[model samples]
Target chain A: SMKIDVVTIFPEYLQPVRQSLPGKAIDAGLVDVAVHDLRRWTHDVHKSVDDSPYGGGPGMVMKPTVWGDALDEICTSETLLVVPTPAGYPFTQETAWQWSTEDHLVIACGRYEGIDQRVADDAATRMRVREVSIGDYVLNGGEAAALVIIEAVLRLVPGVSLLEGPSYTRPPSWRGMDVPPVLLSGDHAKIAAWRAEQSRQRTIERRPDLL
Target chain B: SMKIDVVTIFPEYLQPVRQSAIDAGLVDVAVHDLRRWTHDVHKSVDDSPYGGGPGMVMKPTVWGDALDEICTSETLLVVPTPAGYPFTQETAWQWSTEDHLVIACGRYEGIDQRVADDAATRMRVREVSIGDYVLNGGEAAALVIIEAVLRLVPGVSLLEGPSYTRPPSWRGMDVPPVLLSGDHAKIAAWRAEQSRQRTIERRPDLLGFDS
Candidate 1:
């Protein structure tokens, strides 16, 4: 059973996560979902978790204390801590499969440049921590990227299945070029072929590097 | 002078957006933060414009509604007649400086599977939308990404001045061997060295391509 604790300044951002794949998994008792506000862990009245980088910088890097403390408190054995960021790993279908089997998954949603590198590195020693990129581009923070992986993997969990149809789940053809007629024909074989082609082309056009 | 609309159920996920680099230039008023375009009072159905494609249609893809949805991702390239915008490097960079942005908030952070199914078919339209991974809300994701870019513009805001103190890109002078070799491969060497090392250190998944 995977229990995901999402530490984010914008706890509201994770509301839908519980309702979607993770939510579904959580509801089935296949996963336990806990969303924590990083702000709540603040030690000082200042409640600050970020600062101007020590040597000076373009953006405020997240304070190590904020991440460290929050991370320490939430993560437990079997908790594969995931941090989504531009400076991290490229998330994929396999990641989702892994999270599905883990006993717990704690996600740190970093903002403002990124969570302190030291904190991320330190936490990584005892836990699974890496930067996961949703795409080739960068973002305002890791919360959005966190949701991308959390949801994708949550859905892939073995027991969890979409009650709704595969309308959107199946891949389309030619990397967004056109919808193959086979999908409409309702032939399972042709549909599968179209989906495979679609997934490949989609990977190529949007993420050629992935290919 | 940029306004982007994001359709997401989790408007709260975007809360931290104000604290990002895009907001760094706020003092100079270089960026105007736009309000999110959420579901109307009745959060009935939210999704794509339709052109009659995917079967797992969430609620029957309404072409008109999808065009309206395009407003969120299509800020940089709004063609009067088209239903969507294509994703491009230029669009990506141009959107980097958007003064105000709009995002369509998703309720559950994850849309119904049908949304993704239909989006796949429609993604092929002329407009440049982002490469697909199906994040919860495009708004927060866009904010995370575009904020990084806002830092690139000259004379934009405090973004440029404050970042980069000890640079510490790789933390140590583990320059690529090519750079040390000093061959005509200076440019290629730098690219190969930095990108290779960076990927290996941060993202070994990219190394999968080597095999």
Candidate 2:
């Protein structure tokens, strides 16, 4: 349904993306996806991609030169350059909804500390730049977040909509936890009514600020 | 490195997880790295596993079956079987540390949505209450909590330690946004010191706190 390009050092890390659930989607011809090795863009003697921080720190910073070259080639007005880090905006359903509309997505997955700030900031000027984090904990890199963002965004693509399944049974009951009885009477209108009420209750209890 | 069985009706929906960073660690380590399938269970279908509530509910019942098959003759200490992630950093860390672990993610990736009979009791009992927001699948259910656990497991994977930093002239300083240099060494020291406080504030369970 949509296309996603992932830029990372350990390009092999993306192997699983083409295998299971997402693989099924690919096989089914629902979307276009590609992964690129950031290292290939550099003509360095060592093929080096990271470096020491400006002030000297605990981790290496992503080399901005490589990232700049990589971004310049892949990014565009229709592309979404995603920077995955611990301190970025929380990746959410709403954001996924937004990313789905883009023509291309370039995810910069960094590791060994973080990416060079220049790369992130520079790309921001040319495309739809998003600093996405799935949660607060530090990750070796933003690959996981990139994957999460990719899947969420892809699912929202209109053509991929063919795969969405039936909604869970209404007022569907579970042990001790019962689906509101109103959902089970086999009434779509009433079930919808119940779902609306339930959705409100759920969001308020779990994520009030979103409301 | 552990094997996991993810039972999901929407196997195609997990597209994101299959495509991201964790894809490397998920290599067919066990017989089934993630054996996924949608449980066409007449019950617990479409609803989440936890009854507490959220639009992002997870359907654990089918996941339970998925795990059962994955575990095969081995004894699986499926923690969320009775409905839980155990809500502790220790559990998270423990999961990450282990070479193999099994988890059951509910359908809709949220909590239970219906009323229940004893047959439906399995869904609620095996539920594990993750943090706020009803995620769409145990993939995120596990991703939200478990991936962090896995990342912290020492020796299982190589962390992005400090030595990899690029040289002084590397791309004009592209370190993580917050880690920029007011004082590099001090920042590293600061990160170490704040690690606990940060974890405590976000998930005290990581540090073993009852309150």
Candidate 3:
């Protein structure tokens, strides 16, 4: 089973990951999942994980000490680190596809201004670190973005991906819309062609970037 | 205060919004359960994809009714989808100006496109994507969008900045010495340079930056 660990200050933000697709994957023994509180790595009396930015900014930047210590215990030489942020490289299906092949994935959730840049810089020395952004918008933090990546990646695990794809059921017609007649016509070649065409056209019209 | 309404099936997944962003008083937000609109005993909100796909598609009736009740003349209707316009800081700024924002969360394959088209007849409707990747649904995306846009509200002060913390040295890495300098002018210039360099290296696609 692929092992995935997410470290975030707000452990509550990760509750959905345990209830959604990733949750099912874990229940099925397809993956091992764990959510660690970033504060666990802090020895400070207040468990302070962030402080004023070095150059003096409005928001706090996650302190490197907390992140560095947390990662030291969590990451192995073979672990891949994914840091989610708006300023990072765009996250895409291609990246998820690539990561699903990994042995262990550790995602460090950055909050406030961001994780100290040095945490990422230092992480690169001993393991593969990829800073990624879920999209163009900023998130409250990386927790939700982590959930998104985990779901997308988990779906690619064996039985899960097979259950994904186009599906239909009884009472195919609803209101004025009907499952394309070709699907019910029982012609395998025609159904295949129609499905392929729909996928192609939809991808082209909605997400040409993927093509 | 900014008013944001998010409609989704998994309302529990949105509890963190109430705990974090809303608790901070940055925005007055509500997560509405879409099942309230269903009239049947099953309270089913999704149906198989019209063309026979693996996952279900959100039914139009449920979305149509939910949106009709939630949207107002002054509302900006936002939908999250991989097929929508790219969401960015600029888009968040645009949304921050709205008097009312209703985010319609689509699950399954997606809500029938017409739900958005029809809503556009009465309100400003825009479909947005956080990034190139797709999530299982839009609740997480809604959390992300709400967090990013709410912070942009006048009184909220969370802005991105290059930051550092004490113990300047950690495993051979040191906070940039310039940041610790007492000179404000030099620190300001250094911060801007570091910000520019980081942005350019990570997102050269941003305006006014060279790859």
Candidate 4:
């Protein structure tokens, strides 16, 4: 069985975990999911987790002490520390598949500008630390990114078989929208031929990077 | 105030942000259940493939009914999908200026293609993909898109770049020397160069720059 631990300021962001893929896996005993509040590690009267950047940036940077403390308790030598940020390496299907094979994943979600650089560097010495970005856009925090990541990687776990590819159903006609005639016709081989061509041209029209 | 309306099978996916700028009076947000529009006994939202495929396709009838009720002439409709145009930083900045935004979250093979085509006749419609990976559904993508767009609205936010905090050095990992030099313009140049390098290394598509 694999394990996932998410450390974040807003534990509510992860509430969907119990209603999505990770939760399904948790119930199936294929994985264990946990969410820890990062603020629990802060010691100040304000219990703050961010501070102005050392190099003088406009927004605050998450402090190292609290993140370091929180991560220190949850991760070990083999654990993969996945940090989500706009500055990180792109998170792709390959990245999710690689993560799926790992036994433990501890995701650290940071707000403000980002977390202190030293935390990931320090953690790298003991555990595998990777910084992953979901896309080119900036988000308010990493919670949303973490949620996307959870669904991608965990769905690949064993015993989970999800249907994929283009599909259509009844009403063969609705609002004058007809199901493609090929799909409704009785000739099986012609249907297969058309579906393959449909996808090939679909690839050509969109996503030339693959070509 | 800017308004955001999200219609999805998994409306709970939008919960994390319930406690948000909405409270600050910068925006008013609503999450709707797509099932509310269903007239069937099972409240069916999906159907098996007509051409003999593995996955189910989201039905067009239910989606059209939902879109017709939620969208208006002034609304910018966003459809999140695996094979959509890249949703980037520039897109987020542009979206922040809109008065109303509606995100349609689909599951399985995604809402019928005809849904976006139909909506386009009356208003602006965008199909956005966060990255190169296929997610279980659009809710994860919806979360990512919603966060990126709203955080830029003026109850609003900014600044995502390399961050460092207290402690000039740790475990032989020193904060980059340029940040500590105290030369403002030099630091700006160094940051831009690093950012440029990151974009080139991780996502060359973001720039037309030759490597």
Candidate 5:
């Protein structure tokens, strides 16, 4: 089973993860997901995990002390670290496929300005760390980004194989568009080729970057 | 205030939006269950695809009706899916200015393509993808998009940047001592350099600096 851990200040932001395919995957023993509160690692009475930036800035920067402690307790040498930030590399389907094979995955959710960059640098010294961004946009916190990452990684877990594919059922036509006749043909080779073509065409039309 | 509506089968899945965005008063958002538009007793919103497939496809009728009821002449429909246009900071900036934004979270295989075509005929429709990876559905993608857009709203207190905090030193990591020097010009230069360097190292594609 793959083990995934999300460390975030707003654990509630990830509530959706526990109810859908991810929830089902956990119930079936295919994956184990844990949401950790970053404040839990803070020793301060206020449970503060952020402070104003060292230099002038609009947003607070998450404190390194709490993140360092949380990571120390949660991560093992074998853990594959994923830090989601706009500054990270563009996350892609290929990256998800690579992560699904890991024994343990630790995702650090950065909020405010962002976690002290050093936290990521320090974590890299101990384990393999990849700073990944879902896209070019900025999120309120990494919690939502974490959801995107978890859903992608968890769904690819062995037993849960309901990922994307051009699919059609029963009706031959809908809204004046006929289900490609090739799909209904009983020829296994032709069906496979047609599906492949559809996937490629869809990807090209919608996401040329994937091509 | 900006109006944002999310139509999904799992309305409760978006509970975080209330606390993270709505309660914060950054945006006025509502999550409506897609089943509310269904006429059948089962409240069914999905049907098998026109051609044989492993998973169900969201029925066009339910989507068509739900969208018609929720959107208006000024609403811009943002549909989150893997097979859609790439979402970015530029896209979020564009959406932040819209009078109304409707996020339709398609479940199952996907809402019928014709539904999207029909929506475009009535209002501005953007089929967007958070990333190259596919999720079980678009609910999570909507969350990611919401955070990105809400923060850009004028007067919102949320902040994210290439930022850092105090102590100068932490567990062998130093905060680029220059940040603490209090030299405004030097600080700005350093920050710009840091941003460019990090972006190049992490997301060279963003800088058009990748060679």
Candidate 6:
């Protein structure tokens, strides 16, 4: 079993993880997750986790001190540090599968402009650090992406770009549309060949990059 | 303010939404229950793929009926699927300006293609993939996409370079001296160059001028 410690200012943002499949996985004793509140490490009345960016930009940058302190307490030399950002390398099935076997993961969920660049640079000296982006997109914070990363890394299989053909259910016939007749045929070998062709055709038609 | 409807079997999977983005007041979100459209006693929403496969395909009737009751002329339907077009920051930025978004979450194989196709003819539909990976279901991606889009819709988030915060220096990693200098002109240039440089080293595709 692996362990994950997620540090964020809005701890409640991860409540869904406990109420969903990830929660079930925890109950089943497959993993241990600690959703940490970074504010716990802050020093000010506001539990101030951010401050003006050095060059004065759009929003405040997350304080390196708070992040530094939190990481020191939660991580070990073997811990893998994950920082979710659109600017980082893209996350994939290969990445998830690789992480699934880790003994521990510390995910820093940055809000505003994100943690001071120094935090990541400094931490890499003692632990494995991954600046991962779920996609080439930005979010309010890393909370949502954290949820996504945990779920994907929990179970492993499959890739994207390659796709199977369409699917249908019991109504065999519905609203004037029929499930391709070849499917209902009981010959497993025949259906296998058809599915193979369907997969190949779909991959080429929909995502030629996989080709 | 724009509105969003995310329909999924795991309604609790969207619990985080109410705590963050929706409360921002600029975006209204409705996490709908897909089983609301299921008529069977079991509230079954999926069936074995017609072609006999490892994955189950989502039933068309439940999804079809769900969309019928939820859509409008202003609605931009988003179907999160591995087979969908890769969704990027550009998609989120553009979508943020729209009035409403209806995201469909498919748990098993996915909804039969006809449901999305039928809806496309009536309203704008964007089949979006959050990343180049597969997951247990579309709920996670729905949360990812929703979080991404809502953040861009004003009153939410940003795109900036690595930010440095106080103590001025920590763990032998000092804030870049230029940032502390009173030269606002050069400071602005420094930040701009760093932003472009960071983007170059990581996600070069974001550099629009790149050939």
Candidate 3 RMSD to the correct structure: 4.5
Instruction: List the pairs of residues colliding in candidate 5.
Output: A168-B49, A168-B51, A168-B52, A169-B49, A169-B50, A169-B51
Chain B TM-score of predicted candidate 5 relative to the true chain B? 0.87
Residue range with the least summed lDDT across 10 consecutive positions in model 6 chain A: A155-164
Candidate 4 chain B lowest-lDDT run of ten: B154-163
lDDT, model 2, position A188: 68
Candidates sorted on lDDT, descending? 4, 6, 5, 3, 2, 1
Using Cα atoms, each model's DockQ against the true complex is: 0.15, 0.16, 0.37, 0.58, 0.53, 0.64
The root-mean-square deviation over C-alpha atoms between each candidate and the true structure, in angstroms, is: 9.6, 8.6, 4.5, 3.2, 3.8, 3.3
Compute fnat per model: 0.14, 0.16, 0.46, 0.70, 0.66, 0.75
- TM-scores, one per candidate: 0.58, 0.61, 0.83, 0.91, 0.87, 0.90
Candidate 4 residue pairs in backbone clash: none
Candidate 2, residues B90-119, lDDT tens digits: the string is 456545645555554444443332311232
What are the per-residue Cα lDDT tens digits for candidate 5 across A1-211? Answer: 8888889888877766765544566688887778888888998898988898887868688888889999999999999999988777778888999998899999999877788888888898989999887877777778887888888887787886122445444345556656678767777688877777777777777766655
lDDT by residue for model 5 (B48-167), tens? 765465678877777878888889978899888766778878888888877799998877778777777778777888988787788888888888888888888886711123567866
Which candidate would rank higher by lDDT, 3 or 6?
A: 6
Q: What is the lDDT of residue A165 in candidate 6?
A: 65
Query: lDDT per residue, candidate 6, A66-150, as tens digits?
Result: 8889999999999999999866877888898898888899999988878899999999999999998888777888998898898
Question: Of models 2 and 4, which has the larger DockQ?
Answer: 4
What's the lDDT for all of these models?
Answer: 0.51, 0.54, 0.77, 0.82, 0.79, 0.81
TM-score of chain B, candidates 1 onward in order: 0.40, 0.45, 0.86, 0.86, 0.87, 0.87
Q: Per-residue lDDT for B58 in model 6?
A: 86
Residue runs of model 3 more than 4 Å from their true location after superposition = A21-24, A161-211, B24-26, B51-54, B157-162, B183-186, B207-211
Worst 10 residues of 4 chain A by lDDT: A159-168
TM-score of model 3 (CA atoms): 0.83
